[PDB]
Design a protein around this nucleic acid. Structure first.
Lengths: 682, 80, 203, 77
RNA sequence: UCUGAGAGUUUGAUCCUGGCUCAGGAUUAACGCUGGCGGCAUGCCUAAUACAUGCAAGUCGAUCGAAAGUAGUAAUACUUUAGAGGCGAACGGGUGAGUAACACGUAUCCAAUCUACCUUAUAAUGGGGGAUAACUAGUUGAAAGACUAGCUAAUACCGCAUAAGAACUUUGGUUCGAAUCAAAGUUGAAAGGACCUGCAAGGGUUCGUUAUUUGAUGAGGGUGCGCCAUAUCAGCUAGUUGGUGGGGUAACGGCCUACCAAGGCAAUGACGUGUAGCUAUGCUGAGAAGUAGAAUAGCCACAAUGGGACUGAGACACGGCCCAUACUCCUACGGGAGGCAGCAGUAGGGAAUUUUUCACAAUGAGCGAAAGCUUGAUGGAGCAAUGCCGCGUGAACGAUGAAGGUCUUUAAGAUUGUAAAGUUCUUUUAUUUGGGAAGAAUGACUUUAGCAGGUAAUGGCUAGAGUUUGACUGUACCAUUUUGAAUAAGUGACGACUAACUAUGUGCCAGCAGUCGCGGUAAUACAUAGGUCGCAAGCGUUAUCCGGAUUU
């Protein structure tokens, strides 16, 4: 590569309903503050649609957001927009070098910002903190600066101080420099340099007496200066905070309002000064396919390694493979290798996107993002190589589509077109599972939540032009029967040209913990041994149908007692049919019953949803017994019917504000109560 | 032209320099392989004289071989 | 396949040594029985006109290692000439480079000759040949400039020279030359070339 | 379109208006000859045929055929 | 003399009428398993289905005025052209929807044609005018542009002198619808540019002009033959069948018009129908023939669709135009712009048919004395076992036959298997080092020798000159060029046809299946292990053309 010290790439990570569209638009505008063509005023003149935060925030720009700031090219990316579905977030995280976590201002809960921060801290990647709105009701500075430590305790350092409380918001009291007033209520153009207000000088000093003190964990000379009271150079403490944030020792917090556009220039200055470069970030290594498969890093000079993470179809030129090249330098018109598929891919052309425009750069260096036209066979989750060597892949995706829904094809041709839509929609994110049940028949497709299923439907009907009916998930039952009985089977019949006859006598007995079992009682030669085995099969096929809803009958012990083999009219399949008649007749006599699937669900909650889950299980269904008291949490295991999971994924999640989790494991089939007997039957 | 890749061949033709090649020909005059230069040809200069009498200027670089045929000694200086 | 792999295995079922007799005759014992764990008495239960035709053709290409497409190439080449096509083809059957080198006292086996030729140790008329299938013609000179001192095989063949009127050779000067077309009487007669040329009209 | 077609248009449009004028005045001469027969308009057509057939405006065959027809029908007068 | 091989198959059985199947080839081949590579090509057949982007056919300043900019005190020289004027554009490439007929091919006829640029052949290459282009200023809008008024150049446009020669008119002179001559009547010929020379006068070179006669080229027109099936398609036909005059096409021609009539064709099949680009030819057979008209080559039709015209020698013009249709795109919304059956690339489809790759190195085509410019043609190169050809993955010796395993069924033996182990050797290819091409025996370029009418001299030409041209290519390959067995073999069948079976499981079920047919209790027919055999980086499977089938 060239100048890897400057190829600092970042990701746009915004909270749900925290102005995702708004915050993303302001980040584009400030990143768009390059006056070579007028991108500043061009972004200033944008007023877009308002349907959903994530959707409009994504569709306003392209995923690849290549911009520059005064020395360095930055590739901002906002692919994740969701209830914070994990895979896109972590994939972008491995693509990005650093990230900004947007805090919620309408309320103080911000239940999903803590989740994205958990995911970010999981990878040791550096981050920064910034409250989205300093003008929204409920956006209290004290609330945020106390809640961060109460919920997480990450030693976040609040650097800059605002001026006003959600109505009087008019500037920032800068800590590193003098005060900066922002009279703009939007569309940031000028910053008013002012001296620090007198009444808050001490407000600085204390924090100042802490700030250097907060970076006092790096050297002893800083402590000596603190004892002396001698001021440390602002550049020195700035670099100390940079080392802290890149090393995840602490994280700075800044203030501003997206709807008011105040103090984001300060954020950009901080990003340039303190956020890391690929040389400054740790080495998140990949994995090969041989058994030990890696003792290597990117090395960033000329081994070309780049993770294939997203593809989008431009109508003019076909597919577009967006890739962040981790190492090496690549040109166009060259065949790259995919060892996961062992295939050649010709790089027809290269392209870079800023907001929506194409820039054909014939060469891409390490530490950048780009898109490729060509490469019509590669999917996401893979790593691209051109040296004919096995690919090293770094993938730790988290797939939790805990809810599934059945999508109903209107026709077998509709089934085929929906499978084509599945092929299109699985290349972007295959975490969703699809099953075509052999018994229930309806196609089950997994999703995260209401918005996830909604967006899948939107791509199906609009992006894919595929129209398919939607239904309800399908996993039905099992059948068995009550107390034993013994009947006979006599099939004297014929269909095709001659006589046929057969007759057997069997015992129809339940076996609670054993499947099909055969016991013979032929002592007087009523049935030759040749007919012992076929009759068993006649039983094994007869249980498949039930008189209530038609599920196979299991947990039955069969005991053949007697029979009659006649002359040429007798044949083995006639005995099998007679045994089938006997089995069905006895099943009708012995009052068949049904069994429902039962999953064992374990829920671990600190304190919040104890009574909520108790009442949900008691009201809906399930088998429960009291409490488990784990180290600092409450754990409840319930053996609950699998039907009860319908909407439970969002009944628990809605009550938990998105902070719920569980484990779904199938336990066993259990007797169906009379209510279930009335519901399912037609 | 014809032959193989890395193996060119072009049968010399007194063809109209304004009509495309690889078509019907009034008279084919000579052949030559331009890969290895040894100047093997089957020139006639009998009907080619008539062609030059009625124009029929061959392709661009034929004039060099025309010098070897020595027609300049018998065509342009034929009025004095 | 360019090589049969195991060559004694070829003489097992065939019962004919590709050498004079010493192929499967002196390696500890003489194993001239046909292979197969299912082996049993077989005297007249597997031989027919079709079977003997296959046997002759198989031993014929085994003696030279000709692939199917090259076999049809040689068939068309001998079609290009007239007369008794069987005997003329048989004369062309010696036109292999490795076969000649073996018959020139320059290689104890045609397999060794082939693998020397591919290695580039042979010089065919100021043109080193790596393909050992080139067609011989009378009046060809060969050299073994320098990749022969380190080869004990070529020297051992040189001391065990072969006498032939259709070619000339100075084995002590590493010189060989194709003189005239070979004679039928100098070559094994158990092979029948007619049935194969009857068998080759299938294009 | 391409610039070369624009240049060809910018030329041949005016050349075609000129040719239209020449053809219509030749037509007018033919009309005046059709009204009455005289040697003066015969000379007029003689001149005009050479004016127009000189360029590509009028084909030699057409001009010769028309003048031959007019002089032939004149031969009886 | 070119030149010919079948097999099984009903039934108690035998043949016969006679069907079937494959053994064989071919294929834009497709698919499976796999797969180093050389060289030879080729590499949408689905949707003339819809397409972003780039080139896709432009050139000339020594044709013209002038503009812009450099140098120069200025003049002027130079660099580029906004434009005009000249020419190429109709070449060429691609497609096969249409078209079942002069369309191909073929033999001839055009007593009825034309055909710049290029052949022959001569007459000269003037006198002017009056205009606009470009530009300037204004009007309308972001702009593209559009509109208005002023100034002019051109080898541009249009009169004016003569027309050598032709052509027309008339008279005389020809030939089996003809052609040739003489005289007279009439008409209309050019434009200049550059260079050398010359005080000048003027002369010359060279380009171009005009008209003239003659090649060739291409196009048009005439027919004969050859150029699918359909009668479970027998009437069609009123510009229809001809005649007179006129218009008309490069010419003839109801091609068309006015008038005059009512014929003309068609059972040897018109018309209607569907199926179609045609040929040389690719493949299949010995052939009569069939197969299809790959690619290429020739010819014809088309350029989003229907017309219509436009100049130009030549077009109703891939990439000129208008209308109308249908679409798409932009519009700050008033209006505009366009057509990949061009190169690719992209979307869909299918099983699938590739690079928006390089240089114009060569060739070619165009423009131009000249240099020079264009050239998604061209030549290469990328990719694909897609076909063809060619090569390796070792080789010399090497054991009563290493170890294990298999059968034999504990016993020996065989068996895997010279395969192994072992010694020795090697390197096309893998890979380091230097060599290393022709392709350009062309083309430019001026001075020389010479030729040549002139000569005052440049220039017109032939023999040598190097500064001149390489993507391909420090390429293939080669001196053990470094090391090194190292860098590498699968596939099908094994009851018979059809050269290829043992052990185990197995129970008309599982399954094989080209056919005959197998498997219901130890199956040489299935499934696995081992072994055998045949082809091989190809082997298996499918479709379709033929041989076999002489089985219309």
């Amino acid at each position: 590569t060239v100048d890897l010290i400057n190829f600092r790439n970042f990701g746009i990570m915004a909270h749900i309903d925290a102005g995702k569209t708004t915050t993303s638009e302001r980040i584009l505008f400030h990143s768009g503050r390059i006056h070579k063509i007028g991108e500043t005023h061009d972004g200033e003149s944008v007023m877009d649609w308002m349907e959903q935060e994530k959707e409009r925030g994504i569709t306003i720009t392209s995923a690849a957001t290549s911009v520059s700031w005064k020395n360095c090219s930055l590739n901002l990316i906002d692919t994740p927009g969701h209830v914070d579905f994990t895979v896109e977030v972590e994939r972008s995280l491995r693509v990005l070098d650093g990230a900004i976590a947007v805090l919620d201002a309408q309320m103080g809960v911000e239940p999903q910002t803590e989740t994205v921060w958990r995911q970010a801290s999981r990878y040791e990647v550096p981050r920064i903190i910034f409250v989205n709105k300093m003008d929204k009701t409920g956006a209290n500075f004290e609330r945020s600066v106390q809640s961060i430590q109460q919920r997480l305790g990450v030693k976040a350092v609040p650097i800059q101080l605002p001026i006003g409380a959600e109505n009087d918001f008019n500037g920032i009291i800068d800590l590193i420099e003098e005060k900066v007033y922002f009279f703009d209520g939007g569309k940031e153009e000028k910053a008013e340099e002012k001296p620090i207000p007198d009444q808050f000088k001490d407000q600085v000093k204390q924090m100042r007496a802490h700030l250097v003190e907060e970076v006092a964990n790096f050297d002893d000379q800083l402590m000596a200066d603190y004892l002396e009271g001698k001021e440390i150079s602002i550049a020195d403490i700035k670099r100390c905070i940079r080392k802290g944030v890149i090393g995840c020792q602490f994280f700075p917090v800044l203030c501003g309002s997206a709807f008011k556009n105040k103090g984001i220039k300060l954020l950009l200055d901080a990003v340039v000064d303190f956020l890391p470069s690929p040389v400054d970030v740790p080495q998140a290594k990949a994995y090969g396919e041989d058994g030990n498969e890696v003792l290597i890093s990117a090395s960033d000079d000329a081994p070309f390694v780049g993770l294939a993470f997203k593809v989008a179809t431009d109508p003019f030129v076909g597919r577009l493979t967006f890739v962040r090249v981790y190492s090496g330098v690549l040109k166009s018109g060259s065949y790259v290798k995919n060892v996961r598929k062992n295939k050649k891919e010709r790089v027809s052309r290269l392209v870079k996107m800023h907001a929506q425009n194409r820039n054909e750069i014939e060469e891409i260096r390490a530490g950048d993002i780009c898109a490729i036209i060509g490469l019509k066979d590669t999917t996401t989750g893979e790593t691209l190589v051109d040296d004919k060597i096995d690919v090293q892949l770094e993938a730790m995706q988290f797939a939790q589509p805990v809810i599934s829904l059945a999508v109903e094809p209107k026709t077998k041709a509709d089934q085929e077109k929906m499978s084509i839509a599945l092929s299109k929609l699985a290349e972007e994110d295959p975490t969703f599972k699809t099953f075509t049940d052999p018994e229930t028949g309806q196609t089950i497709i997994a999703g995260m939540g209401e918005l996830h299923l909604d967006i899948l439907v939107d791509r199906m009907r609009r992006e894919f032009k595929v129209e398919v009916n939607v239904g309800a998930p399908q996993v039905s039952f099992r059948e068995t029967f009550n107390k034993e009985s013994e009947v006979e089977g006599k099939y004297i019949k014929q269909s095709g040209g001659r006589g046929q006859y057969g007759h057997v006598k069997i015992r129809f007995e339940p076996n609670k913990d054993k499947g099909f079992e055969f016991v013979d009682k032929i002592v007087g030669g009523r049935i030759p041994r040749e007919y012992i085995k076929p009759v068993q099969a006649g039983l094994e096929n007869a249980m498949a149908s039930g008189p209530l809803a038609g599920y196979p009958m299991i947990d039955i012990k069969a005991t053949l007692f007697d029979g009659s083999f006649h002359e040429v009219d007798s044949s083995e399949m006639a005995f099998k049919i007679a045994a089938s008649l006997a089995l069905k007749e006895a099943g009708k006599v012995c009052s068949p019953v049904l069994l429902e699937p039962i999953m064992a669900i374990e829920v671990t909650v600190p304190e919040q949803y104890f009574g909520d889950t108790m009442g949900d299980i008691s009201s809906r269904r399930g088998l429960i017994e009291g409490t488990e008291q784990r180290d600092n949490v409450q754990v409840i295991k319930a053996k609950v019917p699998l039907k009860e999971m319908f909407g439970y994924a969002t009944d628990l999640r809605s009550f938990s504000q998105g902070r719920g989790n569980y484990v779904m494991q199938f336990s066993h089939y259990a007797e169906t109560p009379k209510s279930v007997v009335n519901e399912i039957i037609a | 032209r014809m032959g193989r890749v890395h193996y060119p061949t072009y049968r010399i033709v007194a063809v109209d320099s304004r009509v495309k090649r690889d078509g019907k020909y009034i008279a084919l005059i000579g052949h030559l392989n331009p890969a290895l230069k040894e100047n093997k040809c089957k020139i006639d200069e009998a009907v080619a004289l008539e062609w030059l009498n009625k124009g029929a200027k061959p392709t661009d670089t034929v004039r060099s071989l025309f010098s070897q045929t020595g027609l300049w000694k018998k065509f342009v200086e034929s009025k004095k | 396949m360019k090589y049969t792999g195991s060559i004694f295995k070829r003489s097992r079922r065939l019962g004919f040594s590709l050498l004079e007799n010493n192929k499967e005759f002196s390696k500890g014992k003489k194993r001239k029985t046909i292979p197969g764990q299912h082996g049993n008495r077989f005297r007249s239960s597997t031989m027919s006109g079709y079977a003997q035709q296959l046997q002759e053709k198989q031993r014929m290409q085994y003696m030279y290692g000709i692939t199917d497409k090259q076999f049809r190439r040689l068939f068309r080449l001998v079609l290009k000439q007239r007369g008794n096509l069987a005997v003329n083809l048989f004369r062309v059957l010696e036109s292999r480079l490795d076969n000649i080198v073996y018959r020139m006292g320059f290689a104890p086996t045609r397999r060794s000759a082939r693998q020397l030729v591919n290695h580039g140790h042979v010089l065919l008329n100021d043109r080193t040949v790596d393909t050992p299938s080139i067609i011989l013609n009378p009046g060809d000179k060969v050299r073994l400039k320098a990749k022969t001192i380190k080869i004990p095989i070529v020297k051992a063949a040189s001391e065990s020279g072969v006498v032939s009127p259709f070619v000339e050779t100075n084995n002590k000067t590493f010189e060989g030359t194709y003189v005239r077309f070979p004679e039928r009487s100098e070559l094994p007669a158990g092979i029948n070339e007619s049935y194969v040329v009857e068998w080759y009209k299938r294009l | 379109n391409i610039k070369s077609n624009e240049k060809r248009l910018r030329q041949n449009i005016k050349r075609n208006l000129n040719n239209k004028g020449q053809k219509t005045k030749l037509k007018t001469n033919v009309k005046n000859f059709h009204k009455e027969i005289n040697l003066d308009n015969l000379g007029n057509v003689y001149s005009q045929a050479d004016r127009l057939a000189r360029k590509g405006i009028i084909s030699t065959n057409r001009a010769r055929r028309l003048k031959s027809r007019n002089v032939a029908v004149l031969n009886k007068t």
